[PDB]
Design a protein around this ligand. Structure first.
Ligand SMILES: Nc1ncnc2c1ncn2[C@@H]1O[C@H](COP(=O)(O)OP(=O)(O)NP(=O)(O)O)[C@@H](O)[C@H]1O
Ligand SMILES: Nc1ncnc2c1ncn2[C@@H]1O[C@H](COP(=O)(O)OP(=O)(O)NP(=O)(O)O)[C@@H](O)[C@H]1O
Ligand SMILES: [Mg+2]
Ligand SMILES: [Mg+2]
Ligand SMILES: [Mg+2]
Ligand SMILES: [Mg+2]
Lengths: 220, 220
């Protein structure tokens, strides 16, 4: 199963979702994380730096915290400029064949990598925020997804109350809402998944429920 | 500079010392960590698993938390038996030339990998706990150190009180003592160096003073 996390707007929580969903899924299924953002947010979130080599897509990977992380690298930049959507899509599918779950983190744009990951995805996951630009982006995702007739699952981040938009037929808003929490800030500073930092940091973990609900709603 | 962490007694703190000293050094100098224990304590402390491949010594490495970590692998086993001591020594020097600091974790024994790491070390560090068996271990470590024309710095772990011993001349006894702290246990649970975890977990990190003392004493 290929799960791609998409949002045109930056800072909405794409990397956090990819990191924690892949970490949650790796608890009982063989999971990989493909960092298609050239800036390597997910790579940094697993304690690594983006590779200063032009690697082919999917070549280099490290098993960290039971997730097979494919670190971001400068080669992606080239693909972001010259890449063929068909070729990149096929490579992503060949990569996904080795995992029960391949979570793909994508850049905050509508570029080649994001479009390829969005096209090959079995599940498309988008976080929405109370911020205005995220609302514009969720409506744009609904329109462009309407065109090729694919669906996404939207959940809410940076909020205690769900954000839902009316007359977006291609975007299923779940009831999941992830409130502001400096657990995420501390875990990202440390360079580990927040789901993993939580098991040590607090007595009663609370973030595991969000990602269990996400995996629940998207699975099969 | 090559720093080798040595103790034949198990569970005294070899891996904690290797992991945290290499991490501390990584803040200012190009630092690597060479895991020469086939059970891979340092590797696990950097969120990884020992490789189920018989690798040549020093081939695989991952930059985790700014440390170039050479994960343990099953190929160490063969090298423990049939490893040419001079070959292994030259390979370790070969590896360490690329770093300002190469911290080396060793198994709890006297075998070929450990003894090579002792031979080509610029500094050897030994943690001693106030347990009864640890004193015999530091004793016979002095016997080992004289037999190879080498000398080592000793500090105390799991204690507010320093351990020193009068009789042994190849073992310089520092005043450095590291008290029992639940930070190390929480960090091993996480699979990160305790220094990094502490720098994210509390307002005023305080474990770094011990490893600063260690760096100061071993670099004079
Ligand atoms: N619910 C939350 N509460 C508090 N901080 C959060 C939350 N979710 C995410 N963050 C933090 O907000 C920052 C940005 O989140 P991030 O996951 O990088 O979004 P992003 O979409 O990947 N940014 P980008 O890849 O550049 O488009 C990170 O430092 C996260 O740790
Ligand atoms: N000062 C300390 N306070 C509390 N726990 C500690 C302290 N130092 C080490 N530990 C813990 O003690 C355990 C054993 O330490 P470790 O660093 O693995 O020693 P070791 O010599 O490498 N074990 P081994 O490779 O089998 O000989 C680990 O779980 C550490 O986190
Ligand atoms: Mg990101
Ligand atoms: Mg592997
Ligand atoms: Mg050890
Ligand atoms: Mg490298």
């Amino acid at each position: 199963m290929i799960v791609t996390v998409i949002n045109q707007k930056g800072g909405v929580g794409k990397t956090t979702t990819s990191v924690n969903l892949s970490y949650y899924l790796s608890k009982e299924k063989k999971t990989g994380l493909l960092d298609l953002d050239p800036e390597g947010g997910a790579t940094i979130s697993y304690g690594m730096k983006r590779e200063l080599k032009e690697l082919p897509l999917g070549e280099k990977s490290v098993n960290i915290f039971n997730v097979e992380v494919f670190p971001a690298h400068i080669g992606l930049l080239k693909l972001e400029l010259n890449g063929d959507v068909e070729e990149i899509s096929n490579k992503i599918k060949e990569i996904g064949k080795q995992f029960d779950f391949l979570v793909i983190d994508t850049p905050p744009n509508l570029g080649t990598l994001a479009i390829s990951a969005m096209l090959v995805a079995d599940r498309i996951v988008s976080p929405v925020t109370p911020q205005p630009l995220a609302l514009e982006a969720i409506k744009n995702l609904d329109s462009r997804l309407k065109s090729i007739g694919k669906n996404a699952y939207s959940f809410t981040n940076f909020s205690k109350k769900v954000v839902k938009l009316d007359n977006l037929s291609s975007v299923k808003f779940t009831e999941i809402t992830i409130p502001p929490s400096r657990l995420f800030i501390e875990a990202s500073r440390l360079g580990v998944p927040a789901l993993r930092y939580e098991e040590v940091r607090i007595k009663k973990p609370k973030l595991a429920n969000y990602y269990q609900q996400l995996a629940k709603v998207i699975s099969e």
